[PDB]
Amino acid sequence: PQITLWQRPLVTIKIGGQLKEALLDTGADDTVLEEMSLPGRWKPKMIGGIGGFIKVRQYDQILIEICGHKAIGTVLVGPTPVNIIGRNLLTQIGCTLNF
Amino acid sequence: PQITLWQRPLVTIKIGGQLKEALLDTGADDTVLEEMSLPGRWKPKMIGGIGGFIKVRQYDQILIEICGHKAIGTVLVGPTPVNIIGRNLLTQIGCTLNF
Numbered sequence: 001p002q003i004t005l006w007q008r009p010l011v012t013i014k015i016g017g018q019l020k021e022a023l024l025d026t027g028a029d030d031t032v033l034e035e036m037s038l039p040g041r042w043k044p045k046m047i048g049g050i051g052g053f054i055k056v057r058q059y060d061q062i063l064i065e066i067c068g069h070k071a072i073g074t075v076l077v078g079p080t081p082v083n084i085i086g087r088n089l090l091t092q093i094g095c096t097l098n099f
Numbered sequence: 100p101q102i103t104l105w106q107r108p109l110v111t112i113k114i115g116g117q118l119k120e121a122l123l124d125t126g127a128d129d130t131v132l133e134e135m136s137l138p139g140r141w142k143p144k145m146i147g148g149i150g151g152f153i154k155v156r157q158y159d160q161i162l163i164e165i166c167g168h169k170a171i172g173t174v175l176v177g178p179t180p181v182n183i184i185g186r187n188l189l190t191q192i193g194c195t196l197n198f
């Protein structure tokens with residue numbers, strides 16, 4: 001699809017069998033979701049914004065479907081202001097910016 | 100043009116004819132610029148991201164040229180390490196997300 005930016009580009013994702021709403025964020029290197037349990041191994045990671053770093057859990061090689069497109073990759077879980085799909089998975093579904 | 104997401108979508112912008120690097124950020128509602136001395140009055144504002152909130156100066160009706168496309172609107176000035184072009188101006192240049 002083509003998605004315009006007059007509103008927040010929020011789309012439905014499916015992860016762990018659950019549907020969630022997440023923001024397509026080309027400003028985000030990584031994908032960060034609110035607290036949830038995911039199967040398999042994880043490790044602690046720090047990621048940061050303009051005024052400091054936060055702790056998240058890193059889960060690798062996770063299946064996630066974004067607006068119907070499949071991705072398998074790293075998902076961070078932690079206290080994010082909103083579920084964010086960042087470039088690690090935007091690249092997987094073939095997303096570009098166009099004008 | 101088409102902006103890939105293999106790397107951060109950094110492009111050249113112009114403000115006052117001065118050229119700067121900026122990130123095209125579909126996760127940002129508004130545009131956030133590195134500290135610079137814009138003239139005139141501004142309004143205090145707080146914006147939040149992972150980590151928390153930072154104080155910025157809001158300037159209205161500011162012209163920014165984005166790869167040759169002139170947008171005019173609100174910009175927020177603060178200690179960011181990188182200029183961020185948000186939806187408020189991305190919409191004006193006809194920018195979309197496509198996959």
Ligand SMILES: CC(C)=CCN([C@H]1CNC[C@@H]1N(CC=C(C)C)S(=O)(=O)c1ccc(C(N)=O)cc1)S(=O)(=O)c1ccc(C(N)=O)cc1
Pocket residue numbers: 023025026027028029030031032047048049050081082084086122124125126127128129130131146147148149150181183185
């Ligand atoms: C990329 C950058 C450095 C800054 C741009 N900002 C976020 C928009 N895209 C990215 C950036 N962030 C997301 C926050 C929101 C969508 C509310 S964030 O917290 O810095 C972040 C940092 C790291 C990652 C990562 N490792 O993947 C993910 C995200 S922001 O926090 O200044 C910002 C906040 C608010 C506004 C607004 N209200 O108008 C506008 C901008």
Ligand SMILES: [Cl-]
Pocket residue numbers: 072073074088089
């Ligand atoms: Cl990944």
Ligand SMILES: [Cl-]
Pocket residue numbers: 171172173187188
């Ligand atoms: Cl505006």
